Ligand binder design. Sequence first.
Ligand code: HEM
Ligand code: HEM
Ligand code: HEM
Ligand code: HEM
Lengths: 146, 146, 141, 141
Amino acid sequence: MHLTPEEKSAVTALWGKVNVDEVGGEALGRLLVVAPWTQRFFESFGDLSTPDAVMGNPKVKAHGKKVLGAFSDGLAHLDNLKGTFATLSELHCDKLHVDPENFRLLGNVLVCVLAHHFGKEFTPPVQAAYQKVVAGVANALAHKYH
Amino acid sequence: MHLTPEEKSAVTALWGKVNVDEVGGEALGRLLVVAPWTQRFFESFGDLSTPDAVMGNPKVKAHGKKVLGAFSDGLAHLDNLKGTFATLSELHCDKLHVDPENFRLLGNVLVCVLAHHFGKEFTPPVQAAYQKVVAGVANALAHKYH
Amino acid sequence: VLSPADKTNVKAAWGKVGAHAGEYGAEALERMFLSFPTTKTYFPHFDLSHGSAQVKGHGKKVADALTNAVAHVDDMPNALSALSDLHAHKLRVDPVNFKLLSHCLLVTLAAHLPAEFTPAVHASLDKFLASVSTVLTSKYR
Amino acid sequence: VLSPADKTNVKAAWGKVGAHAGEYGAEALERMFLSFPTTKTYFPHFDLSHGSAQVKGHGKKVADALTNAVAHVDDMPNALSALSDLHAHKLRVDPVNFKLLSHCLLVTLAAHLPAEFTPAVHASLDKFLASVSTVLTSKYR
Ligand code: HEM
Ligand code: HEM
Ligand code: HEM
Ligand code: HEM
């Protein structure tokens, strides 16, 4: 990453306060609602007919936790996101056929969820470092597409 | 810059046959004609009112040759684009205030120009090598923005 | 296309913004400038430092235009004619940038209207900013 | 919007395409596959090998649709409604990919019509492909 020690510290420290369980379910569910077309990959999850139905769907919430988990661990290899997401990158390409654009939609939703959650704490300088991380994650994950 | 050796030989072989003077003028002129908004940087160039006025304007032709000149040098340092384009990146940012998206638009136009000129010789695979290259150059040009 | 639910949700949300839209306008710009530094290329003539009056004022201006848009949610194209003109023929901001301001504006509302920033409201505001962006870039060519 | 000039340009350049539309459609696709490998994710079910009949088959269908928009240059939204529906509801292709195909179609035409691919024609064809893309994406949300 092109993170400043200062920027690294800011990311790291807010993360420390995150409930991945809660944030993962909310980020993924929001995605399914804001950008309804991402639902094409989660037909087997049930009825995503309403915000309520999406936000309530346990399959969604549980997928959300699996996703932020992986993201969470990526934050420990901020200096080689590429090597940390290589296998996950292949998988997404080769098995799931997920368009990398989706990785960017989620990142932005993630940022709206953090702001939502931390209010005051999520300052312009803090969002700025987060924007760089979400872009970095998305790029890493997309890296092995061919 | 994921230029495979075979991709780099291909870029280099074709670049061998280009008349930078000529291509430079066509690429630049064509940009001012397809994305007229880009004309914002050249109000001291005079008459850009029509395609003929643009394509034939001595100032556009002279500037195009400058731009491709710098690009050509870029192609001799495919290994270090960022280094190559550093002072130019600073200039576009700090003095000229050129939104970097402009660099990608020009790359695409350039690719159509090469297709226009080389016909059948601009094969699927040659286009893909040039796609990587215009992208590398745009990125190098945007590296010093802040 | 904004559904009736959508127009409702937007008016509600914006309804709660109230006397703070200007500050939210200003805050969104600041978040945009820091997160997407390339957007600064359009304001070389501004003092982009924290708390600049140039930024605060611009913030109000933007805020006000959104208000007017919510108010004429049914006739945006018309309520924003002049603004679409200005952007297409004078400012000529590149279209990618509208998506960036729209995003910094969600983040700002989210951070300020917790209870109100529900998943359905979020979806609506997004479509809305999208629609607004479409309108402001409709006369580009 | 497309101007009379544009309309003339497009009918003219496309006129020249004639009977090669199919082949040019196949070629635009292959170029797209090679230059923007991410577009491949939409065709997991295709044989994307060189000279794939699936691609030939598909290039032709794309070319017929473009040909149909040219024949109805004054009523594209209606001429392409069905295809707009399909793309919004079934295929759900992300919008950014339209610009990629557009681009590869322009490269292809340029590679085949040196005499007609003038600056003026290039500009018109670009606005046209952008309008086609806008129609196909209109019902997405
Ligand atoms: C922050 C970016 C993301 C990360 C870190 C990530 C990570 C993961 C992980 C760790 C898995 C587990 C699968 C396994 O190991 O077998 C997974 C599966 C999956 N992901 Fe991603 N993902 C991301 C974004 C997305 C997005 C945005 C979508 C679609 C909107 C998506 C669609 C899927 C699907 C459909 C599966 C398979 C779930 C299943 O097996 O039912 N992913 N992802
Ligand atoms: C491949 C990408 C580009 C390269 C390699 C390039 C190169 C150059 C060079 C060598 C100069 C002259 C430097 C000087 O004056 O000291 C220049 C100036 C300039 N460039 Fe770029 N350029 C690129 C893209 C663009 C684009 C896409 C735009 C606008 C959309 C642009 C706008 C300008 C302007 C407005 C000037 C100054 C003209 C003047 O003298 O008034 N450039 N560029
Ligand atoms: C959400 C969509 C937007 C709205 C509603 C909006 C609205 C406005 C308004 C109301 C003005 C002031 C008009 C006046 O001075 O009378 C303005 C000016 C301006 N806008 Fe837009 N804008 C939007 C997006 C953007 C974006 C994304 C950018 C660039 C990143 C931008 C760049 C500018 C600039 C440079 C000015 C002139 C600033 C000055 O010199 O005062 N706008 N806009
Ligand atoms: C102006 C641009 C486009 C046009 C005119 C176009 C037109 C069409 C047409 C006529 C069909 C076949 C429908 C049928 O079965 O009758 C089709 C199918 C399809 N298109 Fe689009 N399309 C465009 C852009 C895109 C893009 C950018 C993508 C993705 C990169 C895409 C992905 C698909 C897919 C996956 C199918 C279904 C193929 C199959 O399973 O046979 N399209 N399109």
